């Protein structure tokens, strides 16, 4: 036992020494001759009313027009963001929903929460209504995030300190990603959908392999739990949002933290992060009802999208980078650019 | 300036708005209660009192009030990560086993219940949500205090080991665990696994909370 513990200690020290040996210069020392982005002004173009309780998640469609938003009145609403029309209003079997996801083909949505199941709704049916296609059960804690790979595979992350990869057609997990020590609060899929990262309630994000089921790398550095995580569009860097009022930009190939986005004025946790289309901007929703827009290469902004009256609990940019939609606990989705 | 299809899409959107408003008005006249308390505290008795994994939802009705109880003790996770989903409930039913004042977890089960009550009653989300504290196993507590002393749980206790004043002492401890006394109330009740007055007590406490909420709403309180 003691030999294994001392071996783990020596191996952690070896990992730290290897991570220090490759830190020749920080990202501030190299992105210093970049002209800043200036002042970013965004106005609420749209305001989507119709939820009657706290909105807990949203997700854009891949056509950059259709939304889906989950609130705890038991409703999944699918908005047409250009005209604010409600395309569908799906009544959930359990109103305690904590996440939603819009399939990349547009045929399905998924949602889950304190009921531990990830229901999958079929949008394009012949009888013209939206019915539950699958109810993926097998988690023993609340389901915190879920993302579609295609119309048949969805990866979820629960408070079981584990993530899982499901097969929608059969309804059972084909892969269970274990290795965390706290509640996994969010995940984010790679653009090529071969890898994904997950941020848990132990201040560590882990990079998983989808086809293998192993944890490639582990990224520590946060002082508190990680409530949100997104990929750089390049596919080989990611940002994490924590409860210590700090975004951090980790890199997959350098295997360490590159930059920390913090401000002495900010003392509230971070609920949602998302990069812009080119990756230059790092939007982050906070608990102080705002949404700061950071410079991903300079880390020198607080460009506030102050339009909400409660905690901004979710946000995401469209696939064409044309808009930013933020949902908050005040039951209103706003759309910014 | 809309086309023939866009007008019909807006009409579908307005029907969806109408159904959402109807569902909201239907779900606003329903009491939302939250069951808490440690394991083996007797909340199974309370969810059996109605007689009409994950979260468990119990819908029962009474004299013109529809209640919904949310038993959340089934899932084990960081309670501070999902406890804010219940920040708009009407009351909080909190079950405590009186017969667990001497049992140990190997610490003291009554002290664990007191710690959980201290953590939930003074949470930043339930800063004004009142608590309906049930104290189950009153007859088991009767026999236990007839055999075993209360000093094992509270060494600072100095009263005579009889049922009434020791039960009052336990209730006083739980109510002294309440840092916020200006905003919330604690409606204690000594239930047993026998009688059906529990739903009556829940109805009375919820009616008092509705009265206080309306008084705060229209200025008076």
């Amino acid at each position: 036992l003691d030999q294994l513990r001392q071996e783990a200690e020596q191996l952690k020290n070896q990992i730290r020494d290897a991570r220090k040996a490759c830190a020749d210069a920080t990202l501030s020392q190299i992105t210093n001759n970049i002209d800043p982005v200036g002042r970013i002004q965004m106005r609420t173009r749209r305001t989507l009313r119709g939820h009657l309780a706290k909105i807990y998640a949203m997700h854009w469609g891949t056509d950059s027009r259709l939304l889906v938003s989950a609130s705890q009145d038991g409703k999944l609403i699918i908005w047409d963001s250009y005209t604010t029309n409600k395309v569908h209003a799906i009544p959930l079997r359990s109103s305690w929903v904590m996440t939603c996801a819009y399939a990349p083909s547009g045929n399905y949505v998924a949602c889950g929460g304190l009921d531990n199941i990830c229901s999958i709704y079929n949008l394009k049916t012949r009888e013209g209504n939206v019915r539950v296609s699958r109810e993926l059960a097998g988690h023993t804690g609340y389901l915190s995030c879920c993302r579609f790979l295609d119309d048949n595979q969805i990866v979820t992350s629960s408070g079981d300190t584990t993530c899982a990869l499901w097969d929608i057609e059969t309804g059972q997990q084909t892969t269970t990603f274990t290795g965390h020590t706290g509640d996994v609060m969010s995940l984010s899929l790679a653009p090529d959908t071969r890898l994904f990262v997950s941020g848990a309630c132990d201040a560590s994000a882990k990079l998983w392999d989808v086809r293998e089921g192993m944890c490639r790398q582990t990224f520590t550095g946060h002082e508190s739990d990680i409530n949100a995580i997104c990929f750089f569009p390049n596919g080989n860097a990611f940002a994490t949002g924590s409860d210590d009022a700090t975004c951090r930009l980790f890199d997959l190939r350098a295997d360490q933290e590159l930059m920390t986005y913090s401000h002495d004025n900010i003392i509230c946790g971070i609920t949602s992060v998302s990069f812009s289309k080119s990756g230059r901007l790092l939007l982050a929703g906070y608990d102080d009802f705002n949404c700061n827009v950071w410079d991903a290469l300079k880390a020198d902004r607080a460009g506030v999208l102050a339009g909400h009256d409660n905690r901004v609990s979710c946000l995401g940019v469209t696939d064409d980078g044309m808009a930013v939609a933020t949902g908050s606990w005040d039951s209103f989705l706003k759309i910014w650019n | 300036t809309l086309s023939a299809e866009d007008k019909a899409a807006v009409e579908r959107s307005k029907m969806i708005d109408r159904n959402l408003r109807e569902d909201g008005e239907k779900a606003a006249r329903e009491v939302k209660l939250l069951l808490l308390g440690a394991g083996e505290s007797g909340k199974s008795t309370i969810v059996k009192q109605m007689k009409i994994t994950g979260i468990v939802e119990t819908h029962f009705t009474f004299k013109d009030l529809h209640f919904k109880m949310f038993d959340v003790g089934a899932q084990r996770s960081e309670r501070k990560k999902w406890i804010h989903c219940f920040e708009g409930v009407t009351a909080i039913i909190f079950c405590v086993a009186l017969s667990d004042y001497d049992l140990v977890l190997a610490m003291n089960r009554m002290h664990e219940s007191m710690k959980l009550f201290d953590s939930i009653c003074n949470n930043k989300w339930f800063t004004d949500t009142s608590i309906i504290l049930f104290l189950n196993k009153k007859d088991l507590f009767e026999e236990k205090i007839k055999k075993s002393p209360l000093t094992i749980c509270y060494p600072e206790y100095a009263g005579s080991n009889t049922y009434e004043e020791a039960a009052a002492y336990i209730q006083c401890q739980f109510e002294d665990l309440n840092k916020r006394k200006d905003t919330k109330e604690i409606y204690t009740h000594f239930t047993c696994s026998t009688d059906t007055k529990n739903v009556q007590f829940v109805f009375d406490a919820v009616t008092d909370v509705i009265i206080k909420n309306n008084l705060k709403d229209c200025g008076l309180f």
Partner: single-chain antibody
Amino acid sequence: VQLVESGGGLVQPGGSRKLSCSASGFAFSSFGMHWVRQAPEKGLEWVAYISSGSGTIYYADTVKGRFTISRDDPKNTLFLQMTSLRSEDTAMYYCVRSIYYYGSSPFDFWGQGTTLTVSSDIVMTQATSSVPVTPGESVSISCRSSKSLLHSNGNTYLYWFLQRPGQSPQLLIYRMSNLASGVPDRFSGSGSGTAFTLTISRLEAEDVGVYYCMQHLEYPLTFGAGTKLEL
């Protein structure tokens, strides 16, 4: 999915009749419903439309006042109360399902029809009412409109229907390029405002019939003269 109409037969000129279509197999209260009719040897012609929730009703100008469309949502039935019939008013009356949201495919399902015998707009033009077919080609027909169907949304509300001999019309292409669910990838639509084309590839049977081009930019929805292709 089933739409079965009833109430046909023979009526003397003048008077009244009530057509009823019983819907089964879909969420009837969510679909707007249309009535379209087809004269014995002519093309299609729109008659009436009631919305979902009955909050919007339109009629054709040759029908307004004499007919009354109504729906019974708990009974899953659609009614056409027609009064003061004429000799021209004889047709086969189809009941047409149609749902309207972003990306929907209205006019997708059609009833079977009931024969009824009696003892300013947008003009859609078909090229020729008959196209010869020899084995081993890829037919391509056209339908020229009299008004720009390209709305300022980018949508071009022109639909393409197929009516097999002795069958009900079937939706092929909605909004000039989107082929309906269940049709092969042979059928392709193209064109611009006021100029449209349906392209079929890899000749085979089961595509024999009259092809109708409908517009949907504004009411009344005017069909085309139809284009037969046979061999």
